[PDB]
Amino acid sequence: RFLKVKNWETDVVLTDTLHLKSTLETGCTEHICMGSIMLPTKDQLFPLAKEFLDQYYSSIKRFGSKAHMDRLEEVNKEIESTSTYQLKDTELIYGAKHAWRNASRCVGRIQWSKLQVFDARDCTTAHGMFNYICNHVKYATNKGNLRSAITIFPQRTDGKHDFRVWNSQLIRYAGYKQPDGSTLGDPANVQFTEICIQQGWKAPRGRFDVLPLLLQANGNDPELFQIPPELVLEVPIRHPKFDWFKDLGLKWYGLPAVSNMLLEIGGLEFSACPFSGWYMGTEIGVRNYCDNSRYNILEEVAKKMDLDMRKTSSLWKDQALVEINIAVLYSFQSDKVTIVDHHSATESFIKHMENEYRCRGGCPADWVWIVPPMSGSITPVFHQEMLNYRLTPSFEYQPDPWNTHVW
Amino acid sequence: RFLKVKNWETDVVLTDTLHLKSTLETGCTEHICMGSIMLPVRTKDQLFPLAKEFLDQYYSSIKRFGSKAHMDRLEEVNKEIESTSTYQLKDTELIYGAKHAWRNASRCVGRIQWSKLQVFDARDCTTAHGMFNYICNHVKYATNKGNLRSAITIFPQRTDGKHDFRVWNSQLIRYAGYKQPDGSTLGDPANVQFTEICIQQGWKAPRGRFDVLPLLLQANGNDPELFQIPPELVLEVPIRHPKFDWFKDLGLKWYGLPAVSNMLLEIGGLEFSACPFSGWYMGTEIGVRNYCDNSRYNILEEVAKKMDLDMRKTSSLWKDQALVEINIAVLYSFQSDKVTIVDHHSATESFIKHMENEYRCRGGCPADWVWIVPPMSGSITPVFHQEMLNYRLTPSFEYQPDPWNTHVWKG
Ligand code: HEM
Ligand code: HEM
Ligand SMILES: Cc1cc(N)nc(CCc2cc(N)cc(CCc3cc(C)cc(N)n3)c2)c1
Ligand SMILES: Cc1cc(N)nc(CCc2cc(N)cc(CCc3cc(C)cc(N)n3)c2)c1
Ligand SMILES: [Cl-]
Ligand SMILES: [Cl-]
Ligand SMILES: [Cl-]
Ligand SMILES: [Cl-]
Ligand SMILES: [Zn+2]
Ligand SMILES: [Zn+2]
Numbered sequence: 051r052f053l054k055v056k057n058w059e060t061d062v063v064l065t066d067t068l069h070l071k072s073t074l075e076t077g078c079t080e081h082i083c084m085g086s087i088m089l090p091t092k093d094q095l096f097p098l099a100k101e102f103l104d105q106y107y108s109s110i111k112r113f114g115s116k117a118h119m120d121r122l123e124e125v126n127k128e129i130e131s132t133s134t135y136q137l138k139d140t141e142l143i144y145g146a147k148h149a150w151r152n153a154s155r156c157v158g159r160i161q162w163s164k165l166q167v168f169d170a171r172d173c174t175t176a177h178g179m180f181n182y183i184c185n186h187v188k189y190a191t192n193k194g195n196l197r198s199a200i201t202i203f204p205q206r207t208d209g210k211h212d213f214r215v216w217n218s219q220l221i222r223y224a225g226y227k228q229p230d231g232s233t234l235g236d237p238a239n240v241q242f243t244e245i246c247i248q249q250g251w252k253a254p255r256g257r258f259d260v261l262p263l264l265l266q267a268n269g270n271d272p273e274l275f276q277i278p279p280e281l282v283l284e285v286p287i288r289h290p291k292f293d294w295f296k297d298l299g300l301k302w303y304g305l306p307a308v309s310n311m312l313l314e315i316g317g318l319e320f321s322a323c324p325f326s327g328w329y330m331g332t333e334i335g336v337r338n339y340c341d342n343s344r345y346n347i348l349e350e351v352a353k354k355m356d357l358d359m360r361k362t363s364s365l366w367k368d369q370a371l372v373e374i375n376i377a378v379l380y381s382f383q384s385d386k387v388t389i390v391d392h393h394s395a396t397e398s399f400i401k402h403m404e405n406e407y408r409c410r411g412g413c414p415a416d417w418v419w420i421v422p423p424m425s426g427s428i429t430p431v432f433h434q435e436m437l438n439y440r441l442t443p444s445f446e447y448q449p450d451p452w453n454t455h456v457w
Numbered sequence: 458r459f460l461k462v463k464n465w466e467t468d469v470v471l472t473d474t475l476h477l478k479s480t481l482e483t484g485c486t487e488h489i490c491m492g493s494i495m496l497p498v499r500t501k502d503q504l505f506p507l508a509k510e511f512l513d514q515y516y517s518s519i520k521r522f523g524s525k526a527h528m529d530r531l532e533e534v535n536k537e538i539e540s541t542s543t544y545q546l547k548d549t550e551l552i553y554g555a556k557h558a559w560r561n562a563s564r565c566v567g568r569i570q571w572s573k574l575q576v577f578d579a580r581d582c583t584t585a586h587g588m589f590n591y592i593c594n595h596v597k598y599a600t601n602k603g604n605l606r607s608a609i610t611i612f613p614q615r616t617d618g619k620h621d622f623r624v625w626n627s628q629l630i631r632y633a634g635y636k637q638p639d640g641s642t643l644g645d646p647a648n649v650q651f652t653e654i655c656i657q658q659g660w661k662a663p664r665g666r667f668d669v670l671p672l673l674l675q676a677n678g679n680d681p682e683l684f685q686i687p688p689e690l691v692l693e694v695p696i697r698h699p700k701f702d703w704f705k706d707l708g709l710k711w712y713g714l715p716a717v718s719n720m721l722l723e724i725g726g727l728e729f730s731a732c733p734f735s736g737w738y739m740g741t742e743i744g745v746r747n748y749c750d751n752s753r754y755n756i757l758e759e760v761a762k763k764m765d766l767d768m769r770k771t772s773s774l775w776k777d778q779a780l781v782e783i784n785i786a787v788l789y790s791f792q793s794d795k796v797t798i799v800d801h802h803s804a805t806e807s808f809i810k811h812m813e814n815e816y817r818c819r820g821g822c823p824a825d826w827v828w829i830v831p832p833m834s835g836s837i838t839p840v841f842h843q844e845m846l847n848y849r850l851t852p853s854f855e856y857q858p859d860p861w862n863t864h865v866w867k868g
């Protein structure tokens with residue numbers, strides 16, 4: 051009931067009591083840990099509503115108050131009659147902030163309370179969606195001084211009138227299978243690109259083509275829109291010491307904006323809820339550039355560096371990795387676009403985690419995702435024991451809409 | 458039940474059925490994953506099923522399941538348990554068991570090697586002097602003048618829990634640590650507590666940065682005794698860098714033989730509380746953990762200073778640059794001295810090949826991602842994007858309390 055986590059570097063031991071409020075399943079059992087698996091009615095709805103409203107009212111120190119009891123009754127009455135209910139703006143904001151607070155895979159959560167929430171529940175069409183998104187992009191980007199934001203479109207009703215952003219991120223690069231056999235641009239986006247082309251997009255067929263938005267309103271067929279090119283802030287990548295680096299012709303976008311997840315607040319399901327923050331440098335320099343299924347540039351970089359690539363034991367891959375990540379951070383910093391390096395981000399996280407343990411009784415964290423994809427051991431999260439469990443409100447995965455959508 | 462794992466780099470999907478043989482607990486529940494938690498006198502009644510499970514596995518493995526020899530062995534073990542409360546393993550069973558404990562070790566990236574383990578049966582040992590002699594032979598054999606060979610030495614099993622064999626050292630070879638009055642540490646901070654015990658026991662400490670600890674050995678539940686491993690048996694590598702000539706002057710070296718001596722080996726329900734086992738190093742164990750952990754030799758700052766990196770802000774990645782250079786140095790040094798070592802790219806590539814083979818031939822390969830992914834450059838190794846399933850198979854290696862906490866002193 052009281053669970054201990056130890057830091058193996060500092061010997062500090064912390065006690066978790068918050069896990070007793072865990073609700074969804076982890077995927078693990080007493081027999082098998084699924085910690086490294088990436089994806090492991092009115093009747094149902096009122097309990098979830100009550101659970102949420104209780105935590106809300108507690109948070110504003112009005113638990114058991116008349117206003118609390120009246121609100122619970124109101125929602126009971128609304129579900130009984132309408133089969134769903136509507137969140138107050140205050141509840142929406144609290145819910146969205148807490149879904150981020152509860153995101154056990156996010157190292158960036160020290161920031162959770164400063165989230166700007168844009169209520170787009172009045173949106174009715176795809177063109178409406180496009181306007182809201184352009185506004186979110188411009189607000190979040192803020193000329194390179196990035197601010198966290200989320201935009202919340204209308205909730206699911208009967209599941210046949212869903213709002214969805216078909217893009218996995220608001221901003222991402224196209225991917226094209228070539229006659230050659232290789233891939234041009236981002237291999238991660240090959241399927242989505244094809245769908246854009248099949249829906250009508252005139253693809254430029256280049257290496258860094260910002261994809262169009264494919265937007266679905268009210269369960270209708272999705273529609274194509276181009277984000278105003280002047281709202282997409284991009285950074286050309288150069289190195290502070292290697293002059294040949296710019297010649298690789300690399301760039302990335304400044305705004306990471308996840309658009310394919312589902313937000314659950316008090317049983318209500320927000321299927322379109324794009325949210326954005328700013329990048330940790332390794333996300334671009336390790337994952338996006340160096341994964342074998344992504345831009346896969348390690349070999350090209352190592353070649354230009356004149357490293358001995360005969361044997362793995364020369365650590366050429368590791369040298370090239372560091373330099374690529376130096377270049378990313380240098381480029382963003384020189385262009386004054388917000389970015390955080392993995393040492394700074396994980397140090398901030400450990401501070402946030404300690405605050406959370408003392409003020410809230412715990413901080414669910416998924417070590418597999420919290421430890422950065424390079425230099426793990428020399429960051430303060432590596433030696434930190436974590437407990438992973440699911441709290442609501444939450445962000446959840448959901449299937450890609452092209453499998454689901456009835457055309 | 459069939460469980461699928463995916464590789465996110467290759468899209469290759471494997472199917473695990475071996476999890477159906479899982480026994481002990483993970484620490485996890487449907488509500489809480491304890492995947493990142495480091496640590497999450499048996500009755501006759503519990504013992505025979507454990508014995509039987511094991512002997513069934515052993516006899517299937519030799520393709521004699523259900524044979525007369527199999528049935529006779531079950532009956533022979535059953536009666537032995539009835540009349541003595543325990544039983545003795547045959548040598549073949551002990552060998553099989555020890556190899557399987559390694560094969561089942563979910564935190565071990567080196568498991569491609571599991572079937573090539575030299576097993577030294579020390580079950581006839583009765584004294585700490587006898588233990589010392591067995592351990593010297595193990596070290597000499599495994600070291601093999603730098604051409605390292607995997608080995609385990611198995612001392613007598615637990616009986617009543619009052620007569621345990623223990624190696625009090627956490628590894629057979631490890632460097633002393635000395636906490637100074639000023640609060641600094643000379644040598645390896647991981648071994649301060651054990652060093653103090655050795656000193657208390659009568660060890661004359663050289664008080665240097667790399668003093669090889671004496672062995673502290675307990676036989677048959679007696680008080681442990683001190684022994685110095687012959688210096689000529691301790692193979693060490695001075696650490697230098699292929700391009701930086703000042704690296705050697707940091708004064709670093711490390712021992713070639715990683716030999717874990719504090720774990721418990723469980724086979725067929727029997728408990729082997731002294732079972733030191735050794736392989737060879739992956740480079741990051743020395744370069745990342747032993748050298749660069751803050752609670753260890755903590756050399757990152759000193760190295761980065763000598764490299765003249767911009768240390769004013771973490772975003773220069775000065776820490777990461779120094780880390781790579783230190784690890785290059787460790788691999789270069791071992792390779793130059795012809796002492797076996799494996800780099801993390803090679804070790805993880807071999808492990809993935811091992812893992813896929815295990816899925817194909819065995820129905821699974823329990824693996825602990827937190828441990829399998831190397832402590833640097835995780836994502837560019839082929840294990841990072843590999844989904845794994847962690848579960849406990851027996852035979853197994855287990856943690857046990859440090860013996861100074863539990864031992865009843867005879868004086
Ligand atoms: C403000 C700066 C932010 C930073 C630096 C940050 C950092 C990260 C990183 C690094 C990861 C995944 C691990 C990796 O890529 O190496 C992640 C995951 C995640 N983040 Fe954050 N984040 C930030 C803002 C946000 C915001 C504003 C939200 C929502 C409001 C959010 C929600 C999530 C969720 C749900 C995941 C897991 C995604 C998944 O399961 O695929 N993050 N974050
Ligand atoms: C032969 C070469 C070997 C290599 C390269 C190797 C490598 C490793 C590494 C790298 C780890 C932990 C991850 C890390 O330290 O960064 C580990 C853990 C482990 N190894 Fe292996 N190993 C080898 C041989 C063996 C042998 C012979 C055994 C026993 C028969 C063994 C049993 C284990 C066990 C039980 C663990 C988990 C330790 C714990 O939980 O504290 N290994 N090994
Ligand atoms: C809002 C926000 C801001 C910010 N800076 N970063 C994010 C996360 C974005 C993200 C996007 C993708 N496509 C993949 C991952 C890791 C995918 C992954 C991780 C691990 C640890 C293993 C694996 N197989 N895949 C993370 C969100
Ligand atoms: C036989 C053998 C051969 C060989 N080459 N290596 C080993 C493992 C040795 C080992 C020894 C210690 N003290 C700690 C760890 C990991 C400690 C650790 C790992 C992680 C992932 C987290 C954490 N907190 N601590 C591993 C055994
Ligand atoms: Cl990304
Ligand atoms: Cl990834
Ligand atoms: Cl070690
Ligand atoms: Cl460690
Ligand atoms: Zn688990
Ligand atoms: Zn990746």
Ligand SMILES: [Zn+2]
Nearest residue numbers: 427433746750
């Ligand atoms: Zn460490």
